[PDB]
Scaffold this motif. Structure first.
Motif, PDB file in Angstrom:
ATOM      1  N   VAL A 184       0.825  -1.203   0.000  1.00  0.00           N
ATOM      2  CA  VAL A 184       0.000   0.000   0.000  1.00  0.00           C
ATOM      3  C   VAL A 184       0.862   1.258   0.000  1.00  0.00           C
ATOM      4  CG1 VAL A 184      -1.908  -1.139   1.182  1.00  0.00           C
ATOM      5  CG2 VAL A 184      -0.137   0.033   2.511  1.00  0.00           C
ATOM      6  N   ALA A 185       0.471   2.236  -0.808  1.00  0.00           N
ATOM      7  CA  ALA A 185       1.206   3.492  -0.900  1.00  0.00           C
ATOM      8  C   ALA A 185       0.361   4.660  -0.405  1.00  0.00           C
ATOM      9  CB  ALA A 185       1.659   3.735  -2.332  1.00  0.00           C
ATOM     10  N   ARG A 186       0.039   4.648   0.885  1.00  0.00           N
ATOM     11  CA  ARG A 186      -0.767   5.707   1.481  1.00  0.00           C
ATOM     12  C   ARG A 186      -0.010   6.394   2.614  1.00  0.00           C
ATOM     13  NH1 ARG A 186      -2.764   2.302   4.602  1.00  0.00           N
ATOM     14  NH2 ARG A 186      -3.170   0.116   4.033  1.00  0.00           N
ATOM     15  N   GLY A 187       1.178   5.881   2.922  1.00  0.00           N
ATOM     16  CA  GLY A 187       1.982   6.457   3.984  1.00  0.00           C
ATOM     17  C   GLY A 187       3.079   7.359   3.457  1.00  0.00           C
ATOM     18  N   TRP A 188       3.167   7.471   2.136  1.00  0.00           N
ATOM     19  CA  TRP A 188       4.181   8.308   1.506  1.00  0.00           C
ATOM     20  C   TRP A 188       3.538   9.452   0.730  1.00  0.00           C
ATOM     21  CZ3 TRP A 188       8.775   5.063  -0.894  1.00  0.00           C
ATOM     22  CH2 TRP A 188       9.565   4.587   0.162  1.00  0.00           C
ATOM     23  N   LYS A 189       2.222   9.386   0.569  1.00  0.00           N
ATOM     24  CA  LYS A 189       1.485  10.417  -0.152  1.00  0.00           C
ATOM     25  C   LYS A 189       0.432  11.062   0.744  1.00  0.00           C
ATOM     26  CE  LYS A 189      -2.228   8.895  -2.373  1.00  0.00           C
ATOM     27  NZ  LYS A 189      -3.683   9.203  -2.293  1.00  0.00           N
ATOM     28  N   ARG A 190      -0.300  10.232   1.480  1.00  0.00           N
ATOM     29  CA  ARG A 190      -1.339  10.721   2.377  1.00  0.00           C
ATOM     30  C   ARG A 190      -0.726  11.377   3.612  1.00  0.00           C
ATOM     31  NH1 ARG A 190      -6.218  11.511  -0.039  1.00  0.00           N
ATOM     32  NH2 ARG A 190      -6.292  13.482   1.134  1.00  0.00           N
ATOM     33  N   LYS A 191       0.205  10.674   4.247  1.00  0.00           N
ATOM     34  CA  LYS A 191       0.870  11.187   5.440  1.00  0.00           C
ATOM     35  C   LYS A 191       1.575  12.507   5.145  1.00  0.00           C
ATOM     36  CE  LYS A 191       0.002   7.039   6.902  1.00  0.00           C
ATOM     37  NZ  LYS A 191      -1.065   6.841   7.921  1.00  0.00           N
ATOM     38  N   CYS A 192       2.736  12.421   4.503  1.00  0.00           N
ATOM     39  CA  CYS A 192       3.509  13.609   4.161  1.00  0.00           C
ATOM     40  C   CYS A 192       3.716  13.707   2.653  1.00  0.00           C
ATOM     41  CB  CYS A 192       4.862  13.585   4.874  1.00  0.00           C
ATOM     42  SG  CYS A 192       4.764  13.896   6.653  1.00  0.00           S
ATOM     43  N   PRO A 193       3.270  14.827   2.065  1.00  0.00           N
ATOM     44  CA  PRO A 193       3.395  15.070   0.625  1.00  0.00           C
ATOM     45  C   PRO A 193       4.840  15.306   0.200  1.00  0.00           C
ATOM     46  CG  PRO A 193       2.568  17.028   1.722  1.00  0.00           C
ATOM     47  CD  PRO A 193       2.610  15.944   2.762  1.00  0.00           C
ATOM     48  N   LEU A 194       5.762  14.585   0.829  1.00  0.00           N
ATOM     49  CA  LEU A 194       7.181  14.717   0.516  1.00  0.00           C
ATOM     50  C   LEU A 194       7.589  13.736  -0.578  1.00  0.00           C
ATOM     51  CD1 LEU A 194       8.296  14.842   4.236  1.00  0.00           C
ATOM     52  CD2 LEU A 194       8.435  16.785   2.667  1.00  0.00           C
ATOM     53  N   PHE A 195       7.262  12.464  -0.379  1.00  0.00           N
ATOM     54  CA  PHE A 195       7.593  11.428  -1.349  1.00  0.00           C
ATOM     55  C   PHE A 195       6.558  11.381  -2.470  1.00  0.00           C
ATOM     56  CE2 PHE A 195       8.858   7.451  -3.131  1.00  0.00           C
ATOM     57  CZ  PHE A 195      10.166   7.259  -2.730  1.00  0.00           C
ATOM     58  N   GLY A 196       5.423  12.036  -2.247  1.00  0.00           N
ATOM     59  CA  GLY A 196       4.369  12.056  -3.246  1.00  0.00           C
ATOM     60  C   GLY A 196       4.296  13.378  -3.983  1.00  0.00           C
ATOM     61  N   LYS A 197       3.544  14.323  -3.428  1.00  0.00           N
ATOM     62  CA  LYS A 197       3.391  15.638  -4.038  1.00  0.00           C
ATOM     63  C   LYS A 197       4.749  16.238  -4.386  1.00  0.00           C
ATOM     64  CE  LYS A 197      -0.096  18.854  -2.865  1.00  0.00           C
ATOM     65  NZ  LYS A 197      -1.448  18.595  -2.299  1.00  0.00           N
TER      66      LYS A 197
END
Lengths: 16, 28
Positions: A1-14
Motif C-alpha cells: 500500500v502506498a498511502r503512507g508516503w502520499k497521504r501522510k507527508c506530501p514529501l515522497f508524493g506531491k
C-alpha cells in the motif's frame, strides 16, 4: 500500500 | 524523507521495517 508516503507527508508524493 | 514517513507515522516506536518491508516492494 502506498498511502503512507502520499497521504501522510506530501514529501515522497506531491513533492516527489 | 521516506523512512520517517512510514516508520514515524505508526512505527514511531516500531523497528524500522515497513520502510523496505512495506514501502520497499514498490521502490524495489
Amino acid at each position: 500500500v502506498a498511502r503512507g508516503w502520499k497521504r501522510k507527508c506530501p514529501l515522497f508524493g506531491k513533492g516527489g | 524523507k521516506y523512512e520517517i514517513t512510514t516508520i514515524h507515522n505508526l512505527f514511531r516506536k516500531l523497528t524500522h521495517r515497513l520502510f523496505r518491508r512495506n514501502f520497499g516492494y514498490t521502490l524495489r
